[PDB]
């Protein structure tokens, strides 16, 4: 039983992005949705917190909100031209911030709050106030480029908190493991030429950004060797993701020797997600958390911070997030994941599992870890 | 430009199945859904018809409803013990018809209507009134066992229409191709010992029924060799599904020589579906329809009937169904699928594509077609 | 049994107006809605048509769509400055057309189609092709001022069709009876100085526009005496509305002697509506339709056109609209309104009923009809 | 600034009641709803709490949950025959508990929790731990008869807490003021023959139970004179409700001299509610709370407990509940009710206001208070 922080704020559920039919904007041949719909609905994140409450887990955590990330915090990552336009659209009722980047009224302040939850979670663990922490950051961060919103992300949540910790708290080497099912292209770009931040992405081959695999992009200049892309095959499930972690991610952590491990923790690799094609269940996320926590215990005194990213299965993500918080806190509630046994039966058979293992083996060899 | 029937009835959208959070029943650890949700929502089927209307396709089709399947029709497939319990629950306001089989008030009559749309679509094509036909049958049929509801299905839609056509219209050999992403276990079971109906299922390996692949189940007795299961790898997309059709399904059709080809046409292999993990787009469904229509032209005077099964991506299924109706009617509207290019970029790379091709090749060899 | 036209088009259900929590725009202290919500949802209008289908009424009507109102049609009512801005916002993806006037992508074309359904319904009845007609016009029209959108209305549906009929079909005197629960301020303004169009509004005192009663606004110049406002007391129900019709509206019709009677037919006086406080049920709307149809038989050869306006009780409006179409067509289906008896019991007692009767009596005397 | 308790539990939002189209059950002529809908959705209560959080009010309150009401607690009000059937249906997955009484899985435990929140709120104020308290009890209580569920209510929340306080805490005279817009028939029945509990209901004449006004039902036996029904006219607004309070309710409180004042606090008199026809706004509820709090200060040392009942305007109830909590706590947030000015303009004009005042005057005279 560890002292585990949970950083969240009701306001993060109020960020809106206009009318969508799942991911499609309304208009032309896309009929308006009759009820809910839009993928980045707050309901997925809210239902996770709701389940944490009814399970009795919440009162055993250190609950916190946070001051929003300041303008100085944002400027470590994003140029003023981007921030001023983001704020302008937000200030004027919402609208488009470039193609496929809809935001709502006050989304600017809410995005800053989301980034601040990450900032505070990182600071608390580094100072030793908490053993580990989870930040329920909405909107997400890991696709956000310095000057371009992408994939529902408007600020670079994890990079903002990292650069803050580097300027204010003397943070050294840090590893960012991104197991959101989509490529962490924002994190990758920001740290591409830097050897002080090790960026690792496990992602469905070609999912988002579309067509990007990226195993050959290892970083540039001083950063060469300090970026790792693991494009897993669409359809992969529990065995494949855990194999990738233990075979590539953990050995990379051991070679890098970080002061802190941050997870870009998306759940959209879950077996019901509409936005990707992987077959993970709640125990998959439970095991992956155990793997990185134990690495944290060996490498940086257990210092581990997880920042929420994606996840779009409204009824199933809550069980995956509870599993992560149970593993992170070391507290097991009475909740049994009602789809666990079902998804276990759906797992790829041994021919696929071994084919995927081969491919992970080649990646490990390509990255100098085998 | 063919004379294409479209069989549908507003009442089929009124069948309900109680409260669900996507697929999970409400209760215990499953929070009630705040808005829409439940997977077998009518909205997916309605949005397809709506798009057919606004695209201008609908008036160029032969629109029809149908008389419901009669009690005699149902009795060719289902025993009275099952039918009487189904009707009893339906008559008393809805409820459970065995584990995981929720139905609503009047679901019995609506299920009979759904089966009747299939009955009529088959009869019209056989009589030469239409060149081909599509039946928007809701609730679906292909998981329904004679005495057990499964997978949202309460009557065996396609088998009921087939046995009707065999008793009333002298129908001989027929092939049923099931490209709903889940295994057509209901069709398979009903015809397992029969050589007059060739049953073929393309399905995600192990998806539903969970854990079932089934390549080795070829039929029994006189039916041995007349059932074909193609368990494709989760994650497979456009290349893999079309390869399976041309490599296994078409050659099997040519050897069997049917009088009629019926498609169990589900769309849940689409790249956004929450209930499976395949990567098909609208052109995938367009090409598969072309493949089976051209087979129909060579083998049974173009006689082709498609019966709607699954499909749970509420914004994307409509574009897939429009594509099928465009291919089936030979009429192309102005509608461009707004996600086509996106999903094309997400397709598995050549290593997976070739691995899956190998596996299809082994299946073809196992089935005596190579 | 009359030849009754029903003018509708699926596209009218696709007009959207952004994100709303019932009537409130999202932002500030207004949390985004978790599911459906926004008042001018298409679902109310769609559920009426759906019920018409399942009841068996639809095939006994003359179903039609219409060519959209042309730019010349719109210019009889609206100045180019307003139309060009409306089209500009619509053409650029939707947005605000002045304060509290949100519209969506393509709303311009859909509004023109809505107005065209009214245009065609009026033309068919005038030419004697139909005995009477109903136009399911969405978006609504009766609050639209020449140069200002108001109350969900972006074009003046009924005035556009009237002026079209006056220029193309030699239409003379016409009476417009508006029993939408809100004041028909758009119709009133357009015809304020004209004696060739008699405009009558029954509306909840002060509801919308807010604070407007209007009994003393009788028209201006040549139009003085040709506008009639009946501000009924919030809470009034079946007795009060029918009394107002027979006591003020019918006698006014008899004195004016119209060539055509058009109903601005809103249902938001229904006993469940969130946007007003009246207690009407389906038989109330059935009786009001009978009253105006019989007036039409006496005054203008039965020529009666009804144009859909408001109505925001998603489960109850469909029964009210069916009732109107049953009365209009002279066809009674098997449908019994499941809330009729309930709402009948909720009706104001005799003290209120008589107080409201007194007030109607004073209005009748004020208008020279008693 | 008072010490104000707020009793709530996430589990109360999980009680479900099956599929409804607003208030209508699905089936027959009632089409299933496409999105949200059903009137007793948790969203109304949740959005109030959400707004309390984002406004900054919540941390200034004493937040509490409660132990559920025990079986002994329930038995002070309800017979075992009713409780055992309620629990049986709840234990078996939900279903009907008599006509028009749908409940869901585990609704029994959740109803007990709802009643326990009321029990605890009453106990805390009586013991002097809090100055006043609000209980966010869902499901509601005030229509529940001892042996019959009615109007969304399955246990008699306020009577259960009262009888508990009378047996365990020596509670004497108590007054229950019910300003939910519907008649508190459950409270009335339970205390009909008792002079130790004064029951007062302000309600829309004839709304629910339908057709019931009840001014002449004053209580029976020893209870005669200790029940007060104020059937206000549908359509009444701010002036009328406040006049009734000051003219009938406050003088009745002063004559009775209670030890405690409990409000059955429903918000469905709000000007947007689908289930009644009154025109109250947030300041109306703010003023009514002030009136009863000041009475509490004069009569029973400020001891005031409010228990949540109805309220079905999903976007507007939250502003009314915030207003009540602001008045109750003596803390004003920055939130301005965005519809206040609008609803103020909709208020009945002076003719109605004076007519309603007359009727209240007669009631006051009938009850011996003028
Ligand atoms: K995405
Ligand atoms: K790097
Ligand atoms: K990733
Ligand atoms: K299924
Ligand atoms: K067979
Ligand atoms: K299949
Ligand atoms: K309005
Ligand atoms: K006029
Ligand atoms: K009106
Ligand atoms: K009620
Ligand atoms: K009493
Ligand atoms: K009341
Ligand atoms: Zn993602
Ligand atoms: Zn399927
Ligand atoms: Zn209206
Ligand atoms: Zn109520």
Numbering used by the authors:
A (entry chain C), B (entry chain C), C (entry chain C), D (entry chain C): 2 to 371
Give me lines lifted from the publication on this model.
Overall, the structure of KpHdaH (1b) resembles the structure of P. aeruginosa HdaH solved earlier with an overall r.m.s.d. of 0.41 Å105. All cluster 1 enzymes eluted as apparent trimer or tetramer from the analytical SEC column, and our crystal structures confirmed the formation of tetramers for sub-cluster 1b enzymes. All cluster 1b enzymes contain the so-called L1-loop at the N-terminus as a structural feature mediating the formation of a tetramer via side-by-side arrangement of head-to-head dimers supporting earlier investigations. The L1-loop of each monomer, acting as molecular glue, contacts all three remaining monomers of the tetramers. We postulate restricting the volume of the foot pocket, compared to other bacterial deacylases does not allow longer acyl-chains to be accommodated contributing to restricting the activity to remove acetyl-groups rather than longer acyl-chains. This is mechanistically achieved by the presence of a proline-rich loop, the RPP-motif (general: RPPXHH; KpHdaH: 139-RPPGHH-144; RwDhmhA: 136-RPAGHH-143; RsPrpH: 148-RPAGHH-153). In KpHdaH (1b), RwDhmhA (1b) and RsPrpH (1b), being robust deacetylases, the sequence is EGGY (KpHdaH (1b): 310-EGGY−313) the presence of glutamate further restricting the volume of the foot pocket. Analyses of the surface area surrounding the entry of the active site tunnel shows a highly acidic negatively charged electrostatic surface potential explaining the preference for Arg or Lys at −1 position. As a support, we observed binding of a potassium ion at the negatively charged active site entry in the structure of KpHdaH (1b). Notably, for all sub-cluster 1b enzymes, except for RwDmhA (1b), we found an acetate molecule in the active site coordinating the active site Zn2+ ion.
